[PDB]
Scaffold this active site. Structure first.
Site, PDB file in Angstrom:
ATOM      1  N   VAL A  75      37.788  33.219  34.103  1.00 21.47           N
ATOM      2  CA  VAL A  75      37.075  33.281  35.417  1.00 21.47           C
ATOM      3  C   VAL A  75      36.021  34.111  35.443  1.00 21.47           C
ATOM      4  O   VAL A  75      35.008  33.880  36.343  1.00 21.47           O
ATOM      5  CB  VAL A  75      37.982  33.109  36.558  1.00 21.47           C
ATOM      6  N   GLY A 123      34.741  41.915  35.752  1.00 17.90           N
ATOM      7  CA  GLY A 123      34.772  43.065  36.532  1.00 17.90           C
ATOM      8  C   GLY A 123      34.262  44.180  35.633  1.00 17.90           C
ATOM      9  O   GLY A 123      34.232  44.276  34.445  1.00 17.90           O
ATOM     10  N   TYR A 136      36.073  46.922  35.661  1.00 17.90           N
ATOM     11  CA  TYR A 136      37.425  47.407  35.218  1.00 17.90           C
ATOM     12  C   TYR A 136      38.288  46.457  34.195  1.00 17.90           C
ATOM     13  O   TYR A 136      39.416  46.894  33.938  1.00 17.90           O
ATOM     14  CB  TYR A 136      37.969  47.938  36.368  1.00 17.90           C
ATOM     15  N   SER A 157      38.886  41.969  32.679  1.00 21.97           N
ATOM     16  CA  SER A 157      38.465  40.645  32.567  1.00 21.97           C
ATOM     17  C   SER A 157      39.719  39.885  33.275  1.00 21.97           C
ATOM     18  O   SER A 157      41.030  40.295  33.252  1.00 21.97           O
ATOM     19  CB  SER A 157      38.007  40.096  31.233  1.00 21.97           C
ATOM     20  N   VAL A 158      39.626  38.554  33.747  1.00 25.05           N
ATOM     21  CA  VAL A 158      40.517  37.963  34.496  1.00 25.05           C
ATOM     22  C   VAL A 158      40.497  36.567  33.955  1.00 25.05           C
ATOM     23  O   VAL A 158      39.421  35.989  33.780  1.00 25.05           O
ATOM     24  CB  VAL A 158      39.987  37.977  36.140  1.00 25.05           C
ATOM     25  N   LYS A 201      45.076  39.967  35.229  1.00 23.09           N
ATOM     26  CA  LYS A 201      43.831  40.779  34.900  1.00 23.09           C
ATOM     27  C   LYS A 201      44.266  41.619  33.814  1.00 23.09           C
ATOM     28  O   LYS A 201      45.292  42.342  33.831  1.00 23.09           O
ATOM     29  CB  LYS A 201      43.418  41.523  36.247  1.00 23.09           C
ATOM     30  N   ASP A 240      40.972  44.861  45.174  1.00 20.14           N
ATOM     31  CA  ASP A 240      40.832  45.899  44.344  1.00 20.14           C
ATOM     32  C   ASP A 240      39.328  46.002  43.719  1.00 20.14           C
ATOM     33  O   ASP A 240      38.709  46.956  44.132  1.00 20.14           O
ATOM     34  CB  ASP A 240      41.754  46.093  43.238  1.00 20.14           C
TER      35      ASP A 240
END
Ligand SMILES: O=C(c1ccc(Cl)cc1)N1C[C@@H]2C[C@H](C1)c1cccc(=O)n1C2
Ligand SMILES: O=C(c1ccc(Cl)cc1)N1C[C@@H]2C[C@H](C1)c1cccc(=O)n1C2
Ligand SMILES: O=C(c1ccc(Cl)cc1)N1C[C@@H]2C[C@H](C1)c1cccc(=O)n1C2
Ligand SMILES: Nc1ccc2c(NC3CC3)nc(-c3ccccc3)nc2c1
Length: 337
Positions: free
Chosen positions: A26, A29, A31, A33-34, A49, A164
């Site tokens: 999807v 970020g 910090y 990947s998701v 995540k 977060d």
């Protein structure tokens, strides 16, 4: 130990328990990947995540620890919570990857506002939920520090959770004191951010779209006015004090002349949130009791948090130490009912 399986998505190999199925990228970020996934245990769609380079350096390792500690703490309707945390590692020795599992929300608040100005009623509900979550976070003496539209998630029910991190410039939403001092400041830095977000939802426009930190402060002072002597006297840094004293005097604007046609109660709340002096800015608990939220406010369903031990924040440790502490937190994790 669960049975794990491996798959390659994008540049990265994902190794997850068979519990999570149909992983679909999807985005990423700063910090990690998701992937969206189907959680066979709950029947829910979840976000998995995978943290990026979690133990690359001391600050990465401490950041990984911080992230897990904070996520393990959050147990509130309006704050992202931890459904699961796992590693394919069988021992501390081989521990090098951290995966976090949370609810998958429909979208973020940046996606919603990027086409629409929202009706006042919808703004009431969204800002109410942000403040309800913030009362909780702040009650644990936690400051979020990076509230912005991309860090706020919404589902089709218009239910909101504070995240977060998301998948929109931080400076646009940052409290002006994060430029003027550091000794120091309080939880109301997050209230400033909420003010900026609320304004944007009401108008469809970024309130203070500064191109840099100088432009940013200039835009802020154009609305709220240049500091008076009473605020100047509270600034400890000579350079900071002289910086703002050397600016051309700008008078405070009447917010009703800026947010024209808005609910007068909305404008009043914005006046209380976007106060220059953080000693005088409204708190999350106070804001919840503001007349703007009369339709939603329930003093008996705005819970506070258990205490949070942030003593680790002041510690200077080695990478393997932060890594070992992180491993402890993975192992000690108890899934929510
Ligand atoms: O943790 C914060 C901090 C960061 C952001 C916000 Cl909104 C409030 C406090 N600070 C402690 C130190 C010095 C200042 C303030 C600061 C400003 C910006 C980033 C940052 O990491 N820090 C670390
Ligand atoms: O302190 C947090 C933070 C982390 C997790 C949760 Cl649940 C809430 C806030 N943030 C402040 C900044 C930017 C984001 C959000 C973030 C996410 C994860 C780790 C981290 O150090 N940071 C530093
Ligand atoms: O006193 C200042 C300072 C603050 C603002 C401005 Cl415009 C110039 C210097 N600094 C000394 C340290 C680190 C930096 C710079 C900094 C930036 C912003 C706030 C602050 O307290 N501090 C403390
Ligand atoms: N009690 C307070 C209240 C507000 C403050 C503030 N806010 C001003 C809008 C920038 N800035 C600063 C400060 C001190 C040193 C360096 C940079 C900033 N201190 C403050 C102390």
């Amino acid at each position: 130990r669960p049975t794990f399986y491996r798959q390659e998505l994008n540049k990265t190999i994902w190794e997850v328990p068979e519990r999570y199925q149909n992983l679909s990228p999807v985005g990423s970020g700063a910090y990690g990947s998701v992937c969206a996934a189907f959680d066979t245990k709950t029947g829910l769609r979840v976000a998995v995540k995978k943290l990026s380079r979690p133990f690359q350096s001391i600050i990465h390792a401490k950041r990984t620890y911080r992230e897990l500690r904070l996520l393990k703490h959050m147990k509130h309707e309006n704050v992202i919570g931890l459904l699961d945390v796992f590693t394919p590692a069988r021992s501390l020795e081989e521990f090098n990857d951290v995966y976090l599992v949370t609810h998958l929300m429909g979208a973020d608040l940046n996606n919603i506002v990027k086409c629409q100005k929202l009706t006042d009623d919808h703004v009431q509900f969204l800002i109410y939920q942000i403040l309800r979550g913030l009362k909780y976070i702040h009650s644990a003496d936690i400051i979020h520090r990076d509230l912005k539209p991309s860090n706020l998630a919404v589902n089709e029910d218009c239910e909101l959770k504070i995240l977060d991190f998301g998948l929109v410039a931080t400076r646009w939403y940052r409290a002006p004191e994060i430029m003027l001092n550091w000794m120091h400041y309080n939880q109301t830095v997050d209230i400033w951010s909420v003010g900026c977000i609320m304004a944007e939802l009401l108008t469809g426009r970024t309130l203070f779209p500064g191109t840099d930190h100088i432009d940013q402060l200039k835009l802020i002072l154009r609305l709220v006015g240049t500091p008076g002597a009473e605020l100047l006297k509270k600034i400890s840094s000579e350079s900071a004090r002289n910086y703002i004293q050397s600016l051309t005097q700008m008078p405070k604007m009447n917010f009703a002349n800026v947010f024209i046609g808005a609910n007068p109660l909305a404008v009043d709340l914005l006046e209380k949130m976007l106060v220059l002096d953080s000693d005088k800015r409204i708190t999350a608990a106070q804001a919840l009791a503001h007349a703007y939220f009369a339709q939603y406010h329930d003093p008996d369903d705005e819970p506070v948090a258990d205490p949070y031990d942030q003593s680790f924040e002041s510690r200077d440790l080695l990478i393997d130490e932060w890594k070992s502490l992180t491993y402890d937190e993975v192992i000690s994790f108890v899934p929510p009912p």
